[PDB]
Amino acid sequence: GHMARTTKIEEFYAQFGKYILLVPGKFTGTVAAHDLSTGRTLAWLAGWNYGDTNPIMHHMAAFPSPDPYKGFEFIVNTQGGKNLFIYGIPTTVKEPGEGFNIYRVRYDGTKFNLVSNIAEKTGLGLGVHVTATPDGKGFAVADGQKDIFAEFDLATESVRTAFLVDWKPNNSDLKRAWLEGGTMTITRLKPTLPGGKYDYTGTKGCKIDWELVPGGELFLEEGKVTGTRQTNVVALDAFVYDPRGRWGALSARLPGVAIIFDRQDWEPVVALVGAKGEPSSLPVKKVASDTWEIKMDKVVTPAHQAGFSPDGKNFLFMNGVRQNNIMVWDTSNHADPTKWTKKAVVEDPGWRGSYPNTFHMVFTPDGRKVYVTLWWPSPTPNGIAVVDARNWKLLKSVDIGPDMQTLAITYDGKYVVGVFSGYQKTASGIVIMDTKSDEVVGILPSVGGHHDCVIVPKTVEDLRCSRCTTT
Amino acid sequence: TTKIEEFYAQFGKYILLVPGKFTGTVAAHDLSTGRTLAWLAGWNYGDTNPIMHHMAAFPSPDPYKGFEFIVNTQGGKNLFIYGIPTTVKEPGEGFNIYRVRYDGTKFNLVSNIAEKTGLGLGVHVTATPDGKGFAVADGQKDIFAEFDLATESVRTAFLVDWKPNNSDLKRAWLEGGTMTITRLKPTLPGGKYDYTGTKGCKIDWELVPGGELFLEEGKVTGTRQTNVVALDAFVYDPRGRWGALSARLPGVAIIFDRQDWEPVVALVGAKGEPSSLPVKKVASDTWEIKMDKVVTPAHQAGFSPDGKNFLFMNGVRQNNIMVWDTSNHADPTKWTKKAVVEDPGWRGSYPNTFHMVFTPDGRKVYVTLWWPSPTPNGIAVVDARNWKLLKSVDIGPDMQTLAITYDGKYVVGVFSGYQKTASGIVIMDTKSDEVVGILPSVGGHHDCVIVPKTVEDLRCSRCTTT
Ligand SMILES: [Cl-]
Ligand SMILES: [Cu+2]
Ligand SMILES: [Cu+2]
Ligand SMILES: [Cu+2]
Ligand SMILES: [Cu+2]
Ligand SMILES: [Cu+2]
Ligand SMILES: [Cu+2]
Ligand SMILES: [Cu+2]
Secondary structure, eight states, X not given: OOSOOOOOSHHHHHTTOSOEEEEEOBTTOEEEEEETTTOOEEEEEEGGGGTOSSOEEEEEEEOOOSOTTTOEEEEEEEEOGGGGGSSOOOOOOSSOOXXXXXXXXXXXXXXXXXXXXXXXXXXXXXXXOEEEOTTSSEEEEEXXXXXXXXXXXXXXXXXXXXXXXXXXXXXXXXXXXXXXXEEEEEEEOOOOBTTTBOSBOTTTTOXXXXXXXXXXXXXXXXXXXXXXXXXXXXXXXXXXXXTTSSEXXXXXXXXXXXXXXXXXXXXXXXXXXXXXXXXXXXXXXXXXXXXXXEEESXXXXXXXXXXXXXXXXXXXXXXXXSSOEEEEEEOOOTTOGGGOEEEEEEOOGGGOSSOOEEEEEEEOTTSSEEEEEEEOOTTSOEEEEEEETTTTEEEEEEEEESSEEEEEEOTTSOEEEEEEEGGGTSOEEEEEEETTTTEEEEEXXXXXXXXXXXXXXXXXXXXXXXXXXXX | OOOSHHHHHTXXXXXXXXXXXXXXXXXXXXXXXXXXXXXXXXXXXXXXXXXXXXXXXXXXXXXXXXXXXXXXXXXXXXXXXXXOOOOOSSOOOOOOEEEEEEOSSOEEEEEEHHHHHSBOOOSOEEEOTTSSXXXXXXXXXXXXXXXXXXXXXXXXXXXXXXXXXXXXXXXXXXXOEEEEEEEOOOXXXXXXXXXXXXXXXXXSSOOOTTHHHHHHTXXXXXXXXXXXXXXXXXXXXXXXXXXXXXXTTTTEEEEEETTTTEEEEEEEOSTTXXXXXXXXXXXXXXXXXXXXXXXXXXXXXXXXXXXXXXXXXXXXXXXXXXXXXXXXXXXXXXXXXXXXXXXXXXXTTBSBXXXXXXXXXXXXXXXXXXXXXXXXXXXXXXXXXXXXXXXXXXXXXXXXXXXXXXXXXXXXEEEEGGGTSOEEEEEEETTTTEEEEEEEOOOOOSOOEEOOSSHHHHTTSTTTOO
């Protein structure tokens, strides 16, 4: 009785509605779109076919389309250089490709089309998170080896702003370069090359020779990451957007700070400090027409993933490794981020060790729940935490598989869709969870080491629960 | 509100293994849980044109604890014939042959047999019936070889060449010619051959479906266009002793004796033509087949699981399945045409019937029905006792290979989007001949295998058919 009778998969896919899931492949070099209504992969593209010799396809965001099945557009970036060598793949390659491309891709109803390489046009090779603006007409990209981020206009493929962030440690000893505090300097960059182009293509600008991998923020203070400016790293990660407009939050993993920027006059306005027991924020001081500073007397713990709720009235930042928790700010005052204050912290007895890290997130459309991945190194099963986003309490945790990464949600709020990625060498898959029962409804196969996933949105309201407001 | 558990619960514990073609990957999926167990990306290892092409897996006592397989690659201008608007000017040479092992957690790239042996061969890979060796054929170079797995060494390699009766390219096959088969010997230090990368190519890419006409029309570039035969596969008699080498352009299957390493007879696909033509030895290492005309090309070739039937699919100028009685295991010169499967809807080049799989009991054979965009592609179901088409089922664009679960319950195939549109894994119930579902697949796969547990399973794997 253990073998099922012949069974069709139709009822399974029918439940989900008409939604397209888009994924990058990390070490596979691919991007793909899957139709959740039929099980078909609609299209894929392999970056090496186009002459990208190190296409570590990393992060992505897609823009609202009136009908994603007839067409949509998205940005996907890559890493490059010695990032090829940090996931245990026993490759003999001596000189890896430079990478750090930013690709604009359009689905036309049949296939993907590689529209442009925005890193080549602009000179900004940036390899970490990609986020769409709330209006769906621009996007940002950050990089945690260079510590630069930029917001870009989609129509003109041009840079609206770019900033460099640098650390100056109180103690030059690498072990204590963050623990004992420092000065963070934020600089508005101006392009140096003809055509208003920046000089940051490929590996140019890297302070460290490879990214700080998931769970590995502290490898740098341990002397396990090489580079020419090791104790000047902050590890920028993402620029996430307030769905109400005007503000974005730039996450810096090593100081555990989220810097709030005003997108109207392009200036940083306040620094939110992640660690439990530390102040809600620290002030930003302007020191020159293009330069601001934040002063920290210590850093208690690194932090990583960040996000606004759909209504913009809560901001989350995930402390990791030295504390593993979800820090929550009351951001209801849209006029003045200097007033945003800590309101809650989600903790759990099971999160007391170095791992699990509270990781990627997605909120339900109504804001009542947030789903948060729980990451561990091999071999402990990684999983999903379900959090009550009104009372700020852990409701349930579920084991899924190795190296759990990002989460998306269908726009009707009914299903969370996430990916796990096998540390680029073992089991991987797409996991789907019903948001009424909080149960896994199934795993689909996935050739991918994805660190991102999105459902293609139809409107700017869908972006409030996409790769716009959170990582 | 619906879980996928009952869906995956219908299948036995079977692993599906797939190459990705233009994705550059290889992957293994557990059909009992939906999880991808492991994948590998060839560009990570410095293969700069990893068109991951054909593969075969060997018997494993417990696939979930470990298994091993061969996967090869194509390279050169094969990168430029799928409509991808790449600006790459100098593609990687390719033609690698990789031995990969799954260890119960990940894939490990064991060796590059093409680099070790000096034979770079880019078309079908087949496992021997004992699971201790494998063959690779190449239809740009017209070379095939059988290899020993344990020692990663060459057991035999042969080159096949065409000398046309009429040197005009449009008439180079139609008006016949002489096919010369030459046993090759290594020419470099340490018993290495000198055929790595694009070395030895007569044409710049593998002929496409229906591509014989494009070659005749001067649309295929290459140094030796009128001397190609387009070798496709070396497929195995599951009873042992014999293999069949398919040559697409003359529509001939050359039968080799695997013990003495000599060709013994040439089966001729075309309906209306003789069962076979003799092979004449003309030197210690050279044999000839003489053809006064070539009536039509052929492609798919292979044995039923009992070894008693051999199939060869004529295409382009006829479109049918030719069937020989191969029950006489002692003497292939006696193998004789016994049936032909035709249909009013099969004429010309399309559908191109270029992959097949039999049920374990040999009662049915499932055949791919491939067409160019945008015609829907599908699967034909053929009764392999009466030799008649039963049904055709539409699947999707660019239908490729077919495998079967070793209990005989489900056909598992792949479709590949012409490397740019919709792709997927499709599963069909062999009792109802209905699709039960499609699962997503980032892949342009032109092969697929279910990992076997026994040598009997190879009778319905990438050994007896392609
Ligand atoms: Cl054998
Ligand atoms: Cu049972
Ligand atoms: Cu991140
Ligand atoms: Cu990542
Ligand atoms: Cu991640
Ligand atoms: Cu073939
Ligand atoms: Cu094929
Ligand atoms: Cu192929």
